[PDB]
Symmetry: D2
Subunit: 310 residues, 4 copies
Amino acid sequence: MKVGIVGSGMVGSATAYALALLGVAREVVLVDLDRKLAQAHAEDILHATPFAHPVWVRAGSYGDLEGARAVVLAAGVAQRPGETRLQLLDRNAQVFAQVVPRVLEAAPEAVLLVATNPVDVMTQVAYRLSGLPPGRVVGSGTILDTARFRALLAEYLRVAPQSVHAYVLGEHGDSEVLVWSSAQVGGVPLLEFAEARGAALSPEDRARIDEGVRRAAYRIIEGKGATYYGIGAGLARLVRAILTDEKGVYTVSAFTPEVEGVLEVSLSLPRILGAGGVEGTVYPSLSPEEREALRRSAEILKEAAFALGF
Amino acid sequence: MKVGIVGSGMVGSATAYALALLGVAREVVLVDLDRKLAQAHAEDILHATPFAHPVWVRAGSYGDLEGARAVVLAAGVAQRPGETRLQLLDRNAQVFAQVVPRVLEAAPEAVLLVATNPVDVMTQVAYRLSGLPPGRVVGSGTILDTARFRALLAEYLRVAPQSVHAYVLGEHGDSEVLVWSSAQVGGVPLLEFAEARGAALSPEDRARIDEGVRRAAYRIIEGKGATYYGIGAGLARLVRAILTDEKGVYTVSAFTPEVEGVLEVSLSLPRILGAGGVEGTVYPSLSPEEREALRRSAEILKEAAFALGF
Amino acid sequence: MKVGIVGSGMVGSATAYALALLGVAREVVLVDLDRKLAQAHAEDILHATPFAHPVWVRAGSYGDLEGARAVVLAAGVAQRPGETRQLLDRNAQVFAQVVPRVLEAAPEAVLLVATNPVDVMTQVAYRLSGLPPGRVVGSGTILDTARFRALLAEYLRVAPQSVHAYVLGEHGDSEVLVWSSAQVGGVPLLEFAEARGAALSPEDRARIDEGVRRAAYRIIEGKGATYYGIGAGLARLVRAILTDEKGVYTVSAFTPEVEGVLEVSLSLPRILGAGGVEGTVYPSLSPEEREALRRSAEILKEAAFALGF
Amino acid sequence: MKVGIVGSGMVGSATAYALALLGVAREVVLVDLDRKLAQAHAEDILHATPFAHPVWVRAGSYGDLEGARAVVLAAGVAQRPGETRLLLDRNAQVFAQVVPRVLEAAPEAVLLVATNPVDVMTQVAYRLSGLPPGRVVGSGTILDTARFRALLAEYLRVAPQSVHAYVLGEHGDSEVLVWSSAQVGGVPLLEFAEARGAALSPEDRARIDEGVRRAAYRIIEGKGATYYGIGAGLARLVRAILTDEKGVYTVSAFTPEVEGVLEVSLSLPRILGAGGVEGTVYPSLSPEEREALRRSAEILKEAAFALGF
């Protein structure tokens, strides 16, 4: 039960903390070029373990990823003046070019878990770089978005979120697609459910659920500079799924052969997440309207990972 | 966070066990006419707590149910030589008429959790007797049956059961309705997801599974006398949701204004379960054969109750 | 993370349940000659799982014990019309069959002896297994030590997990509550009580002694046997074994010498991990608690010697 | 079951995070002047909660602290023109306004002090609260005690849970270690060591001493401050309070007499409960350890009244 995290910044350390507090893995290994930093986060998290579960948290190099069943790639970040946005992506793809092969040299049988933004394009980058089957490279995707979509719905409907079977699709960016038509609470369609519960989802208060799912990420960044604690626990959950061979269903990003006519693009979709990564993809019922939001999204993403040449 | 269980039999005391090992509630009071049987089970369970979570588990009287936010009714006088089932049934309901008003006097705010068999007719007996709102008396109903249904589907589809969104409605018994038609996994019709995996789900495969959930409770009985560990845990999980104001949907048995033309009847439907009992009930999408099977079930149950005097 | 349990009776099955609700083991195999019995309990405990943790509970043959890292021994037989100490002879008769067959399938496993009386039965299992003594372990006196600390924590207004005091010797009448080396906060027990406005009069001490000894009594009468208790503590001992805890529990195991008494299984504070008990921690007894433990060891030994062990 | 955290810094939020992942609490309220920063931490953490336990996490004014059993006092940073003084100067002018503003909303709460220099800031909190001295509680040397045990455990090959040893006094350079009253499974440490083979060398003790004292060194070197470890430590104290655990933890609290030093606050082994520390235990010592404690104590008193407390 060993997990590696390349990139010992806020996202990766939060993940390590999440893993260690949730007692999911028995060994988390932090790897960063800032071996000093890697070491501080690791030793800090380790000092937490006496007050949680016994998990051996430690910093290392690529060679100590040996045996790790899943390795979280959260190793992007850079400067932000000054330089443009497609230029930050250009230099993060450079890092994957440097980090991917090296991680595969140590943990070839591991599941790659991309967590560097833009999640989806980087996931694409990592898949083609890795030379692995498509189901082994997995991006965080819209798992935090799906949870927010459910959280807002669960608030509006006055029920538990675990009981709101709905999803966010495609991009983890301002082009995601909220699934309403096939959504479901209690065996009844979601839009239908919200009438007996005396609270019809008007196109108004249901387009604000949209720019609430789309804007959640920003209110944080604009408020404290970065986003970490949330994606960290979500990563730790995906890692738990992989480690336990649970075969849960998550809206994570992965290389997709065909989706809405767009070929060879990576985007979120309901995936069965087990010890071999995605074991199967599910294609939810999509109202003719949302299907449009999917391809439009699935085409943005694809023509993104082309400027990059991927 | 205080929990009462009336009827310290197996099912009674196993619910106390699962409650204490899962560390669900902070205080568990066991009440029985056999004062020493309650005092014995509670002493045993308490010796277990230093090897789990800390729970104050004790045996008391009705007054000690004070401030319990939930009381599980699992009486059931033991059948007598020369007494027919029919007589024992009328006799059990007279223990309920003694129990119910007495617990509700100690904990006028408690949610009633009906365990005794038959659970649908006993849930109706409690409701009539409580003078409480309809959602304040819940019976275990079909939880284990919906679990087992989801589990066999999970074993079959190679997917996490938490991901199989399928319910079992109606009587906890031979007229239970496996609803295949609206069942989803990952936002796709259960039946259609079957080809999105191992080539389909035949009406024989389908019958095999039906038998699977139906014959389930009996094999245990025809092996060790009674089932109680499975129920105990399941029971303990509803009391969690109740204690924690979870508002999550379970297939539990409660009193329903109308189902398929049959009026004022207690059977299981997917319901929102929270701090005040069921807080909503979902009427899940049904096919012709399913609607009918539900009605035959709804009427079977109505008559049972009606003959009994409720 | 596989666990065996031979004896799908009330103790063995309670153990299975406790394991499932606590999520230690990933797989729990119940083995009993009443195949339907084992089947029933397993199936029952299976249904409990979706409401706690995923652990595959099943029933099987000695064969299916392959790769178990601990096998709980809770076998035993029917009391039978008019018998007594020869129910005790008949139980050792059972271990004679159980023990080789359990090790034949899972040779690396730690044996967790549960069939009462734990001490005498832990003796016979050890002497049957031919293993190193640390690999045959009795449920022992863990429930009592737990209960000693428990009541102690009420009468002291502190946390059970902060009272370090032990019960030793037999799991029964001759058990030794160790009052001397008992400490809380590192500091000595009766000091701490006298600094908490809670000095323990001897009558207080007696009250708590009875509370530890007759706890079997009071349950047994009003319900028949005990199982819910022992089951969880057994579950916790399996936790330590699977996880290589090297934690200190007062379990029963074969001791070369105890206060001059030779080759007797009683409870001492022991270091439990993946190989069974891997160290003894022998606490400062008083002169009074020492001659006490001697008699405990003396009694257990004659007990075993009478049986042929 | 409501926790408030005044100061949405890294320690403030790491603690909120730990609370929410460990399911300690049903509601955590982050309170900070940088309302938009406290808000951003609340939302980021909220988004974590689908993947762990249902905990409500939100930022709010002091007023939103109502009915919270524990408020965590974690303000400031740790490097501005003057190091004790100032910040410790400017930080107790924050405690000057934060402490009564907090009780104006949650007057029934236990104050958990997280702000450095923790032992002094706890005294400041106590003096400012006008509460029973047991209700203001400093984080103290909980992480140092842990590190002391995790090392002895490592060496002695036993579970840390079973190394009953402590780290007293001022949390920092001069933190005396209870090397002599340390026990393991009842029996005292040095004796238990000869037993497990690993006899406990003088040079051995030295290594582990620096190991405890220089514990944060590499963390601070790598990133300037610690927060993950203490966040979890805080979360563990909050749980002890929220549950009335009455367990024993080496925490800082106003003490009337220590080693001859009048009215001062520093870490000692305490019974932490629903209403803060509800007892204190003098562990046995040594002529070396005692003098160590004493001068360490009066360092603090000649820092506290050297500031008016």
